[PDB]
Design goal:
Oligomer: part of a larger assembly
Family (chain B): Belongs to the AAA ATPase family.
Radius of gyration of chain B: 28 Å
Modified residues (Phosphoserine) (chain B): 217
Radius of gyration of chain A: 15 Å
Main location (chain B): cytoplasm
Chains: A mainly alpha (134), B alpha/beta (362), C mainly alpha (69)
Number of strands of chain A: 0
Structural class of chain B: alpha/beta
Number of helices of chain B: 12
Distance between the termini of chain A: 45 Å
Strand order of the largest sheet of chain B: 3-2-1-4-5
Bound molecules: adenosine-5'-triphosphate, magnesium ion
Keywords (chain B): Acetylation, ATP-binding, Cytoplasm, Nucleotide-binding, Nucleus, Phosphoprotein, Proteasome
Distance between the termini of chain B: 81 Å
Subcellular location (chain B): Cytoplasm; Nucleus
Order of helices and strands of chain B: HEEEEEHHHEHEHEHEHEHHHH
Chain lengths: 134, 362, 69
């Protein structure tokens, strides 16, 4: 049930964000993420989180992306592995980013998100290496 | 026929020759070496208590027998014959080998938080001991499953014993007590020696208040002996020699009578309360214990739970058993909600004979 | 000092409480905070962890009737 509903919602909401970026898709996906988080479905939550960061990235969102990453990370009882996929997606995103100010801003946001979490330790280490290289 | 006849006779010949060879052998007195004197003189004390200086038969690799090692002295000349591994008492052996049935965690109801605290203390530190090293702590060592009678402490202990792999030592604290001088303290010492020898180990003491009762300032000689046993136990847990990979679980329903030194955070680190089932816990226990009963109606488990206020898990099991009793008494090969209601009211009436149950540590 | 705390702990709030607790109790509090951090899969202990550990360990609060004072 959850797999079907998430795979049905993700393309429709992605399209709705694409032709307008109305951003109501963000709240719809947040409600679906809450449902899957309660149900403990892992792959679902992972897909919703990665798609949320996806669309926030294709949209030229230099602040909404950071805010949404923070809220998603600090939600009530999210799945550690789902947040792990989200952070991995954010790392492969920040890799291909110019514009030093927003580069550093997103790097710092990810560092703050993953300060002291074992499941994201390797990603934070690579992120710190990237920050030091910059 | 002579072939098979002589074959069987030759087999019995081998057996009888082995028996005679055994018959031509005498026993040897087991002692422990205390020190080596002159490469041929060893101060060894026989377990019976006397101490001697004895010789050593040649092929013993004197380095193998160091102060404290068990040896087999000859029964006549008392000369060492062979070094032996550390003794395991028959008591400690059966302690380790008791069968905890095959209880699974699916047979325990309202205890979910308590189950995961017990598992936190027991399993994870012994399977991934480096996470706690990274965080910078030494994982907790002792658990006190304390609660009203029949709330599931011993059932939880049985489930842990059945579902975990590391060595496990079953013991009722009242089955350690012996009338001999120092025997109980010696038995506790042997418990912890076995645990240290088999490094990943758990020691479950059921109804600890048999031994770990408060220390009397005006007690009798028996009380003083049992207090010696208790203090040996306390030293073993958190004395001079640190305990590594040996965990303690202790079950009780009168925690208020336990020694403060025993209840100290250093010895019994985590005291978890197996409280009487709440509404959902009662529902879960009733489902668990009525699953195998052939019910042939619509069962308002909610109504049974509502009338089961103040019950324990054993009380709910008895509710199921009494519903069955009503079934047999009515000559029915099944149970119904009228039977369950009668059973729960009967158990509620039986509960009137109890007394204070809300006993807490400290 | 042996643990790795987050800079938001501020152990002073826990120290300045009216509880008669031993060094073993303090070690138990810190140990339970670390245990909670491990439970949540973090290698840094937070003020949340210390609050929960203290409330779990120092549970001596009972009685002290208010009309005696
Ligand atoms: N939470 C529970 N879930 C299921 N069954 C339970 C539970 N608690 C008790 N029981 C039932 O109680 C009986 C065993 O109780 P147990 O020996 O665990 O009690 P205890 O809490 O150790 O009490 P005591 O203080 O009397 O030794 C079995 O019938 C077991 O099914
Ligand atoms: Mg019991």
């Amino acid at each position: 049930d959850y797999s079907a509903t998430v795979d049905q919602r993700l393309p429709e909401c992605a399209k709705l964000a694409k032709e307008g970026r109305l951003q109501e898709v963000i709240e719809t996906l947040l409600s679906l993420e809450k449902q899957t988080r309660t149900a403990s479905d892992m792959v679902s939550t992972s897909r919703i989180l990665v798609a949320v960061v996806k669309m926030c990235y294709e949209a030229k969102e230099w602040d909404l992306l950071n805010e949404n990453i923070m809220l998603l990370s600090k939600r009530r009882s999210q799945l550690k592995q789902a947040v792990a996929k989200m952070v991995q997606q954010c790392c492969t995103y920040v890799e291909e980013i110019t514009d030093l100010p927003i580069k550093l801003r997103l790097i710092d946001t990810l560092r703050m998100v993953t300060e002291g979490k074992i499941y994201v330790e390797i990603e934070r280490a690579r992120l710190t290496k990237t920050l030091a290289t910059i | 026929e002579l072939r098979e006849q002589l074959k069987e006779l030759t087999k019995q010949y081998e057996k009888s020759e082995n028996d005679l060879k055994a018959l031509q052998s005498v026993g040897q007195i087991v002692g422990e070496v205390l020190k080596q004197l002159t490469e041929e003189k060893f101060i060894v004390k026989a377990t019976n208590g006397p101490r001697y200086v004895v010789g050593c038969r040649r092929q013993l690799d004197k380095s193998k027998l160091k102060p404290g090692t068990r040896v087999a002295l000859d029964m006549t000349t008392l000369t060492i014959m062979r070094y032996l591994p550390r003794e395991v008492d028959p008591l400690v052996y059966n302690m380790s080998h008791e069968d905890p049935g095959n209880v699974s965690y699916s047979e325990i109801g309202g205890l979910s938080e308590q189950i995961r605290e017990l598992r936190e203390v027991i399993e994870l530190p012994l399977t991934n001991p480096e996470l706690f090293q990274r965080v910078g702590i030494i994982p907790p060592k002792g658990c006190l499953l304390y609660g009203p009678p029949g709330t599931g402490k011993t059932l939880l202990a049985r489930a842990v014993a059945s579902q975990l792999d590391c060595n496990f030592l079953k013991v009722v604290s009242s089955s350690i007590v012996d009338k001999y001088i120092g025997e109980s303290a010696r038995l506790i010492r042997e418990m912890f020696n076995y645990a240290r020898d088999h490094q990943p180990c758990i020691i479950f003491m059921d109804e600890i208040d048999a031994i770990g009762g408060r220390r009397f300032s005006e007690g009798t000689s028996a009380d003083r002996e049992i207090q010696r046993t208790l203090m040996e136990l306390l030293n073993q847990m958190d004395g001079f020699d640190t305990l590594h990979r040996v965990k303690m679980i202790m079950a009780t329903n009168r925690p208020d009578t336990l020694d403060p030194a025993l209840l100290r955070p250093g010895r019994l680190d985590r005291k978890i309360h197996i409280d009487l089932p709440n509404e959902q816990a009662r529902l879960d226990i009733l489902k668990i214990h009525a699953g195998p009963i052939t019910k042939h109606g619509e069962i308002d488990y909610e109504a049974i739970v509502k009338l089961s206020d103040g019950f324990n898990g054993a009380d709910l099991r008895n509710v199921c058993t009494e519903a069955g009793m009503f079934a047999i008494r009515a000559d029915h090969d099944f149970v119904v909600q009228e039977d369950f209601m009668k059973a729960v009211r009967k158990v509620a009436d039986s509960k009137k004979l109890e007394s204070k149950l809300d006993y807490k540590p400290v | 000092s042996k643990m790795n705390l987050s800079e938001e702990v501020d152990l002073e709030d826990y120290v300045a409480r009216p509880d008669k607790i031993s060094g073993a109790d303090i070690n138990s509090i810190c140990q339970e905070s670390g245990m909670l951090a491990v439970r949540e899969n973090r290698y840094i202990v937070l003020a949340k962890d210390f609050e929960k550990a203290y409330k779990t360990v120092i549970k001596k609060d009972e009685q002290e009737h208010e009309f005696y004072k």
